[PDB]
Enzyme design. Structure first.
Site, PDB file in Angstrom:
ATOM      1  N   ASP A 101      -7.739 -22.582   7.363  1.00  0.00           N
ATOM      2  CA  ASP A 101      -9.046 -22.246   7.846  1.00  0.00           C
ATOM      3  C   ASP A 101     -10.006 -21.518   6.603  1.00  0.00           C
ATOM      4  O   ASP A 101      -9.713 -20.640   6.054  1.00  0.00           O
ATOM      5  CB  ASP A 101      -9.065 -21.273   8.988  1.00  0.00           C
TER       6      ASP A 101
ATOM      7  N   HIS B 145     -10.658 -25.176  10.395  1.00  0.00           N
ATOM      8  CA  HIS B 145     -11.273 -24.263  11.331  1.00  0.00           C
ATOM      9  C   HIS B 145     -11.419 -24.852  13.066  1.00  0.00           C
ATOM     10  O   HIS B 145     -11.556 -24.030  13.624  1.00  0.00           O
ATOM     11  CB  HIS B 145     -12.687 -23.665  11.055  1.00  0.00           C
TER      12      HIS B 145
ATOM     13  N   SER C  72     -13.539 -19.454  17.615  1.00  0.00           N
ATOM     14  CA  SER C  72     -14.535 -18.991  16.430  1.00  0.00           C
ATOM     15  C   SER C  72     -15.389 -17.535  16.863  1.00  0.00           C
ATOM     16  O   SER C  72     -14.478 -16.719  17.200  1.00  0.00           O
ATOM     17  CB  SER C  72     -15.597 -20.129  15.841  1.00  0.00           C
ATOM     18  N   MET C  73     -16.709 -17.693  16.595  1.00  0.00           N
ATOM     19  CA  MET C  73     -17.377 -16.343  17.250  1.00  0.00           C
ATOM     20  C   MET C  73     -17.060 -16.274  18.711  1.00  0.00           C
ATOM     21  O   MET C  73     -16.983 -15.156  19.156  1.00  0.00           O
ATOM     22  CB  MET C  73     -18.910 -16.460  16.766  1.00  0.00           C
TER      23      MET C  73
END
Length: 265
Positions: free
Chosen positions: A176, A208, A130-131
């Site tokens: 996602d 996700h 993710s980030m």
């Protein structure tokens, strides 16, 4: 390099060949929020590559912890981490990956660590979700890791990923809704220079969290992820034909594959 000749079943198994021990790393460690060092105790001999695994925004070490045993059991020193706070932003996450890698190098050269002598600092990699996957790609663009894996990455479309010279594998999650593939993982993959070994595996139906392991995608995530680190960190070319050659898209759980095989060297 080291260990058994790989097969599909061997790489798809929930555990690699080596027994894994762990050390708790306190949050007082400087430069990141602590975590868990995973290392094999009966691997065949030498120093090993070191790997840091980082979660995403609002998320704890537990969300990516599955990658620790899975990589370590195949002969890697692997640290799954917390960030300083769950709210940390992309460039702060990138700084913390780097601090965590520096920590593994420093502890390998320490007289008071169970992993003393075990990390080869020339062979370091990052895995991020993710980030934290956006931050892993940012670190890859800086040039000082030897391989990178991004798990359902999320990042601004203003980025330097067109500079990446580090072998990069991207796992995309077809459904996602937090980092939609068409807006994140797919353009990131496309921008990586085509002179850089790269691969893109999109998982059928995945949300996700799909590339975090511990789910129906585990066998394929682990096979391709371990093969990426074996090939590009250890230069173990026995792992190349699991990444280059097979008809990946024939798998029920693969909805798209991209790559620039063969990886020459």
């Amino acid at each position: 390099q080291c260990g058994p000749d790989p097969t599909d079943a061997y790489l798809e198994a929930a555990s690699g060949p080596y027994t894994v021990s762990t050390i708790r790393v306190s949050s007082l460690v400087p430069g990141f929020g602590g975590g868990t060092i995973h290392y094999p105790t009966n691997a065949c001999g030498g120093k090993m590559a070191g790997i840091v695994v980082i979660p995403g925004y609002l998320s704890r070490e537990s969300s990516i912890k599955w990658w620790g045993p899975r990589l370590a059991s195949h002969g890697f020193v692997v640290m799954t981490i917390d960030t300083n706070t769950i709210y940390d932003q992309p460039s702060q996450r990138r700084d913390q990956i780097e601090a965590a890698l520096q920590y593994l190098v420093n502890q390998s050269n320490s007289p008071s660590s169970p992993i003393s002598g075990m990390v080869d600092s020339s062979r370091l990699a990052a895995v991020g979700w993710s980030m934290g996957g956006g931050a892993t790609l940012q670190l890859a663009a800086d040039g000082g890791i030897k391989a990178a894996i991004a798990l359902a990455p999320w990042n601004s479309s203003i980025n330097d990923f067109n500079r990446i010279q580090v072998p990069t594998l991207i796992f995309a999650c077809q459904l996602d809704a937090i980092a939609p593939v068409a807006l994140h993982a797919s353009p990131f993959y496309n921008r990586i220079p085509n002179t850089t070994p790269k691969a893109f595996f999109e998982m059928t139906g995945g949300d996700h969290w799909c590339a975090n392991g511990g789910n129906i995608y585990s066998a394929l995530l682990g096979k391709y992820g371990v093969s990426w680190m074996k090939l590009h960190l250890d230069q173990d070319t026995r792992y190349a034909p699991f990444l280059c050659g097979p008809n990946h898209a024939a798998q029920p759980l693969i909805s798209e594959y991209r790559g620039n095989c063969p990886y020459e060297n």
